[PDB]
Write a protein that holds these residues in place. Structure first.
Motif, PDB file in Angstrom:
ATOM      1  N   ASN A  11       0.856  -1.221   0.000  1.00 51.54           N
ATOM      2  CA  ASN A  11       0.000   0.000   0.000  1.00 51.54           C
ATOM      3  C   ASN A  11       0.882   1.258   0.000  1.00 51.54           C
ATOM      4  O   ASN A  11       0.460   2.268  -0.596  1.00 51.54           O
ATOM      5  CB  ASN A  11      -0.967   0.016   1.186  1.00 51.54           C
ATOM      6  N   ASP A  12       2.049   1.194   0.654  1.00 47.73           N
ATOM      7  CA  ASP A  12       3.078   2.271   0.679  1.00 47.73           C
ATOM      8  C   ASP A  12       3.747   2.385  -0.699  1.00 47.73           C
ATOM      9  O   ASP A  12       3.884   3.525  -1.189  1.00 47.73           O
ATOM     10  CB  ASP A  12       4.119   2.016   1.772  1.00 47.73           C
ATOM     11  N   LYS A  13       4.150   1.254  -1.292  1.00 41.17           N
ATOM     12  CA  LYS A  13       4.877   1.178  -2.593  1.00 41.17           C
ATOM     13  C   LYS A  13       3.937   1.494  -3.769  1.00 41.17           C
ATOM     14  O   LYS A  13       4.455   1.882  -4.835  1.00 41.17           O
ATOM     15  CB  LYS A  13       5.512  -0.204  -2.775  1.00 41.17           C
ATOM     16  N   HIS A  27       1.191   3.844  -3.675  1.00 43.46           N
ATOM     17  CA  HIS A  27       0.717   5.257  -3.615  1.00 43.46           C
ATOM     18  C   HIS A  27      -0.800   5.272  -3.841  1.00 43.46           C
ATOM     19  O   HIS A  27      -1.512   5.914  -3.038  1.00 43.46           O
ATOM     20  CB  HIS A  27       1.478   6.150  -4.606  1.00 43.46           C
TER      21      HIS A  27
END
Lengths: 235, 48, 109, 49, 193
Positions: C70-72, C74
């Motif tokens: 979810n971070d990688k 965006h």
């Protein structure tokens, strides 16, 4: 020089927009129904043609901005391309629906081989419910989708016939009289692959006769049961 | 109901069964003539 | 299916399935999730590899692979990779009868 | 009322016996054919009657 | 004959409206009121709407011929408008004819018109369900006598003009067990009340 180059690119873009809308329509028009893999391959193949179009699409959008000069014709050729991209995306969701459809069609053939009177009736109920769920989910997209929806409509009619075989309200004598009118070589309980044979006799073309046959059987099953209730009393 | 004691009743189903009957009677009546007129027009084309 | 134990093993099973999808299933909706995950991982593996042939599912053994994907991106959690790159992220849990949640799951790009 | 009904049937019969008679007979026969001269006399009378 | 018949199509479109309107509703009312509905209210409103009605038509002439009126004179239908009107209605009926007849004028005329195999069945007959279901399956007509008010629950499926089509042969579900239903079946109900 921007317009002159832009007109050239836009004309190429429109041609590419059309070809992409032809390819997206082709994958939607083509119904498996049975057919598997080769359809799934065609979808991923189309996926490559679209990625190729998006690249060419970019190579235009670059050439326009490079030209600049506030030409409306540059932005409209783009508006033409984005249309073809959305159409491709529609075709994507369409091929996706076909794959889920083949999965329920695949579960059906497995249940023909399995057969079982008690199993087929329960199977016929849930499948009818799932099939009805899928068709109402389908909406908008492109044209030729009606062709696919009718294939699903034919699938539901066979599901009603399977439930009748499940009940066992018809004998072989009843199955033979209907078979005479039907002209179908397969009887009431011939084999396990009979689900495929029942297809050849159109559900729409041969529902009325089979329904009329299945109705006359139920009246006879009731008529016989009273004779069995009466035969039991005097026995 | 006010003038004599006699009770009559109409329902929206009564109306819906009129529209049916008229549609059915109009086609029958018009189909009897459209047959009759055809004979005469067929025959006049021969006379002429 | 390419079962993961991490965000490394979640993005590795993702990168392995480059042609099809690899839907990492980080944790579950509680309720003895390990046994239920492997049981659903069979019927979905039948509905995903055999029936559809579109997606694998990598039930990420308790880590924070969902949060890292979810971070990688965006753009229980469900990270749907395309050639090992975060393409689809959807969060939400389900109880024992997660057929409705699975039907609801089918199918976003 | 029985005569009005009777005459309507005889005229309807004579009408059909003009359509078959004209079509079947040849243009060379029609001119001096006896049956066609008789029908045209009867049909003119039965309309007035 | 052509030009007149072409004017006789459009004028038999405005007629049929009056005829249908008349057959469906009018029938429960009395001479004076019946006349006020089709001559004082309907026939006027059709001339305003310009629906191409044939000039001077009344329900007697437009529903039934002069030959068939003369047939009814022979079967004990009196020449009063109300009986001819009533008789034209029972003939061209979509719904089942329920007849309100003290003095038994209606009953005697149905025995005249339907002479052969008009099997008369009081609702109080003992095996009446059997005699009807056998006449439905292969019979000319059935007159039901008594039937004062509250029509029996077993008739309610029959009273529904709906007949279920089981392929070639038509079969309607009356009573517990469905029985076959042949065409050209009549069901007259008459009420001495």
């Amino acid at each position: 020089i921007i317009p002159l180059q832009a007109e050239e690119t836009q004309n190429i873009k429109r041609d590419l927009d059309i070809f992409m809308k032809e390819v997206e329509s082709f994958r939607k028009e083509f119904m498996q129904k049975s057919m598997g893999y080769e359809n799934i391959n065609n979808a991923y193949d189309t996926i490559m043609v679209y990625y190729h179009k998006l690249t060419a699409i970019e190579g235009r959008a670059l050439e326009y901005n490079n030209l600049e000069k506030l030409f409306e014709l540059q932005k409209s050729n783009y508006k033409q391309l984005k249309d073809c991209m959305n159409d491709l995306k529609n075709l994507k969701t369409m091929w996706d629906a076909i794959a889920l459809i083949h999965f329920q069609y695949n579960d059906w053939k497995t249940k023909p081989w399995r057969q079982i009177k008690a199993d087929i009736l329960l199977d016929t109920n849930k499948t009818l419910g799932t099939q009805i769920k899928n068709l109402p989910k389908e909406i908008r997209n492109f044209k030729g989708y009606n062709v696919i929806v009718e294939k699903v409509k034919n699938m539901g009619t066979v599901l009603p016939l399977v439930s009748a075989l499940h009940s066992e309200f018809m004998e072989d004598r009843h199955w033979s009289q209907l078979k005479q009118i039907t002209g179908t070589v397969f009887d009431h309980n011939s084999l396990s692959f009979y689900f495929e044979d029942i297809l050849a006799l159109n559900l729409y073309k041969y529902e009325n006769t089979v329904n009329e046959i299945v109705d006359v059987a139920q009246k006879e099953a009731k008529i016989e049961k009273k004779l069995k209730n009466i035969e039991q009393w005097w026995s | 109901l006010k003038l004599e004691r006699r009770y009559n009743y109409t329902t929206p189903k009564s109306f819906l069964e009129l529209i049916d009957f008229y549609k059915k009677l109009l086609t029958e009546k018009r189909e009897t003539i459209q047959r009759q007129i055809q004979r005469y027009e067929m025959g006049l084309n021969i006379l002429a | 299916t390419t079962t993961v134990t991490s965000e490394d093993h979640f993005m590795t099973f993702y990168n392995e399935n480059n042609k099809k999808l690899i839907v990492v299933d980080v944790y579950p909706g509680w309720s003895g999730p390990c046994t239920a995950m492997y049981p659903t991982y069979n019927q979905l593996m039948i509905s995903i590899d055999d029936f559809e042939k579109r997606i694998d599912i990598l039930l990420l053994d308790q880590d924070k692979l969902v949060t890292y994907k979810n971070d990688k991106f965006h753009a229980p959690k469900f990270l749907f990779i395309s050639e090992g790159k975060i393409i689809d992220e959807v969060l939400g849990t389900n109880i024992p009868v997660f057929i409705e949640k699975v039907n609801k799951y089918i199918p976003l790009s | 009322v029985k005569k009005q009904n009777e005459y309507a049937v005889t005229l309807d019969k004579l009408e059909s016996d003009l359509l078959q008679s004209l079509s079947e007979a040849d243009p060379a026969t029609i001119l001096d054919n006896t049956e066609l001269i008789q029908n045209l006399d009867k049909t003119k009378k039965t309309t007035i009657e | 004959n052509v030009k007149f018949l072409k004017e006789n199509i459009k004028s038999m479109i405005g007629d049929s409206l009056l005829a249908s309107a008349f057959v469906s509703y009018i029938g429960a009312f009395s001479a004076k009121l019946r006349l006020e509905l089709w001559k004082n209210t309907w026939l006027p409103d059709i001339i305003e709407k310009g629906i191409p009605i044939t000039e001077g038509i009344e329900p007697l002439k437009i529903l039934t011929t002069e030959a068939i009126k003369s047939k009814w004179k022979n079967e004990g239908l009196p020449a009063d408008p109300m009986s001819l009107e009533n008789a034209a209605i029972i003939t061209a009926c979509a719904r089942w004819p329920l007849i309100i007849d003290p003095q038994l004028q209606g009953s005697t005329w149905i025995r005249g018109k339907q002479g052969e195999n008009l099997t008369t069945i009081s609702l109080s007959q003992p095996k009446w369900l059997g005699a009807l279901t056998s006449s439905i399956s292969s019979g000319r007509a059935v007159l039901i006598e008594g039937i004062q008010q509250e029509i029996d629950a077993t008739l309610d499926p029959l009273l529904q003009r709906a007949v279920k089509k089981n392929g070639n042969q038509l079969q309607l579900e009356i009573g517990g067990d469905p029985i076959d239903y042949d065409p050209n079946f009549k069901l007259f109900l008459m009420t001495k009340l």
